Amino acid sequence: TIKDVAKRANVSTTTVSHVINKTRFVAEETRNAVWAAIKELHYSPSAVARSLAVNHTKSIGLLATSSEAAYFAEIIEAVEKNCFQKGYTLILGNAWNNLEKQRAYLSMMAQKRVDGLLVMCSEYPEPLLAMLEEYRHIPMVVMDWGEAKADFTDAVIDNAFEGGYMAGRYLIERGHREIGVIPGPLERNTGAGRLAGFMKAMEEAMIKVPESWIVQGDFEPESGYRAMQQILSQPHRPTAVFCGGDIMAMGALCAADEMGLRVPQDVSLIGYDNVRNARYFTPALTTIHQPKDSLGETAFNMLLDRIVNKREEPQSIEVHPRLIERRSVADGPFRDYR
């Protein structure tokens, strides 16, 4: 079809080409002619042809996990802005933590020859680490590890451990000593590491968490529901709960309310994520803020670099969590004695 433009304008296609991409000087007339032709013909230059020729698709892949989740959703939306802004195209792919699905999306991706690859898999068993190596050739950044688990990718690191510690401290310093925790999947950073951060804070305080006070969640409101229930559903119960993520949190609020418990009056709750509508939780959720966007943009950026400046060496940038005081926490019995 570029032939078709060239001839309407009676110029070579080389010409048409150049004008379209201001790639060498063209006579005004000539230029106009082409534009006109382009217009009447209603010409959409083909990207695929172009890709075939220039060797890059100007599009990037996001091998995700799930996208509905607030947390995720929020990240992703960020990414897209960045893509758009630098003219990249976004291929969103959710593997649902499934190998097959993941091998599958991964192949489609290489085949479609994505310029780079954003990876948010949540859990990385060897089998998955393996597959990923098989594609080291295609540039990529993992956005969800706590530390660099490979030398063949960039990594943006969140400091989940230090956010967890921040969480516990706060409780401690607000008068708390009988706390419980609903962590996310241990096979994840946002799971394991947050918990650990939290645990250290406790040990330093000589606080011991009774196993009946620790209930695993899967980041879903239902899981928060069950844990909260199980925790309060017992003889002796904590006076404060540390909840792995804001959504499960939201789930935990629900159940407390259902047992007619008062937050923060009967139980204090501290979350983790600072999702877009945590403030609109009831009560307004006090939580730990994860810098989602910076998380997004920052990843994009490494990729671009690697992509453009043809970097070869793995890199890793850390980002920082921070406490957001809302209204789900109250003073504990030990506050005055400090």
Next chain:
Amino acid sequence: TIKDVAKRANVSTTTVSHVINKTRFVAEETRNAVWAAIKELHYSPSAVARSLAVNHTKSIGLLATSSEAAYFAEIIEAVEKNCFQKGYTLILGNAWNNLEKQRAYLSMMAQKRVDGLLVMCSEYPEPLLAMLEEYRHIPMVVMDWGEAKADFTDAVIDNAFEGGYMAGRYLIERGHREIGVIPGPLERNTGAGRLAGFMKAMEEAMIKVPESWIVQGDFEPESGYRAMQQILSQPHRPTAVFCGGDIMAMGALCAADEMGLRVPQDVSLIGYDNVRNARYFTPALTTIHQPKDSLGETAFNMLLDRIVNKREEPQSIEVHPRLIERRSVADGPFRDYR
């Protein structure tokens, strides 16, 4: 690179090709040879080359609005499943209700030669309807209109008006006569139409809604916050509120709580959407359920059809809302008198 495989296997590329796509019979040996070559060479056939040749990208575009929003997010996630399932690739593009952005994404999309186009723009001013026509050649379905506003696209229709009516009725039948409403943007279906559905129900009941009782929202929790406040922040206030979408709803719950108001005890609330975690609202939100997934799959499906069976004629499928009884509504003063 397919040349490279062909020669390692000492066969023509035509061969290599055929075996790769089981497109004509190949000798086992031959077949194996190729596979081997494919393997050592670590061969990823190129999709772009293939696309160039076969004339279809096997990938689809989603010109969206925003993706963080629960409502949206939920739809989209559905779409992706469908894409994956039939081997399509998903290009997610959010125009943020901005023309430029929209013209922009739209062009990138045609250029990248997407097989079909899923459109969720929210608001469709003529200027936008126009641009869309300019691409009638590329098959597409609008998933967010109340009625068919064009003859050059498929449409999946939601019955927002009948869901709105369902909303009002319920209130009416639960003893209510003093109601307020926080609708979404009138420039939208989910905005205008829901409201109207709701309004009809009232008129039939000889219920009049005092303008100070109607506050516009923008589907965001903050907007729900302000409206609820404004509504209760007045001399005379309703005993029940109809809220345009579950999120603004969640915002309205917050403010009631903040004014120390009791839901449903002091004010009843009925929402609209039945978002994934509405049940986890506090209280568990009573709302109108929109069949998001069917909404998703159903759209995909029309597209495919048009794409494969080369349909030409516009089509339109309706889908149906439905009431979900949770715990944010209470009997009104008139219940016993019916």
Next chain:
DNA sequence: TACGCAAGCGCTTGCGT
């Protein structure tokens, strides 16, 4: 000066043998 030639990018597929 301002522009055209023709080869290449990596596949697919209708004729043949």
Next chain:
DNA sequence: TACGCAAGCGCTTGCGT
């Protein structure tokens, strides 16, 4: 029988004039 030839898909770009 089981396979190869060569033209085409729609752009880009190094040499020339």
